[PDB]
Amino acid sequence: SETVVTEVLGHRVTLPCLYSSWSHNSNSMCWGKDQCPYSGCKEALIRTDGMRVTSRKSAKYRLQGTIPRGDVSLTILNPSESDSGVYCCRIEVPGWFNDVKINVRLNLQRALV
Numbered sequence: 001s002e003t004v005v006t007e008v009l010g011h012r013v014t015l016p017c018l019y020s021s022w023s024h025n026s027n028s029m030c031w032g033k034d035q036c037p038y039s040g041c042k043e044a045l046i047r048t049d050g051m052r053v054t055s056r057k058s059a060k061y062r063l064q065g066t067i068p069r070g071d072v073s074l075t076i077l078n079p080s081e082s083d084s085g086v087y088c089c090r091i092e093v094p095g096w097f098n099d100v101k102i103n104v105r106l107n108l109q110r111a112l113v
């Protein structure tokens with residue numbers, strides 16, 4: 001189950017991810033490219049605890065919504081062709097075998113002419 005986002009041709013683009021029951025005392029999440037990151041959320045594009053981003057692969061990735069409300073959509077600055085493809089938003093939920101995996105396919109194109 002994925003949401004498809006289409007953008008032609010570039011300055012910034014947001015990939016939706018919402019987890020409305022989010023609690024700052026329980027939740028954290030991360031984003032990954034091509035595949036969902038593993039439990040624990042290491043080596044990811046960007047990652048949060050219950051309140052805020054705590055690391056990212058580069059400045060190209062932002063989270064602008066309220067993280068304590070589960071607005072964890074990824075903003076990608078200056079996106080380009082290689083930014084296309086599958087992305088996965090992994091919600092970390094207490095317990096095992098219960099993390100939520102949300103997929104967005106980003107179609108980043110240019111005008112045809």
Ligand SMILES: [Ca+2]
Binds near residue numbers: 097098
């Ligand atoms: Ca879990």
